[PDB]
Amino acid sequence: SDVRYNKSFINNRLLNEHAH
């Protein structure tokens, strides 16, 4: 059960580096 910890921690940071 590691869906938010790594599988959607790295994918979430691409939108933060681009938007913010």
Residue 4 burial (10 A CB sphere; 0-12, 13-18, 19+): exposed
Question: How far is residue 3's CA from residue 15's CA, in Å, rounded to a whole number?
Answer: 18
* Widest distance between CA atoms in the chain: 29
Question: How far is residue 6's CA from residue 20's CA, in Å, rounded to a whole number?
Answer: 21
Question: How far is residue 19's CA from residue 1's CA, in Å, rounded to a whole number?
Answer: 29
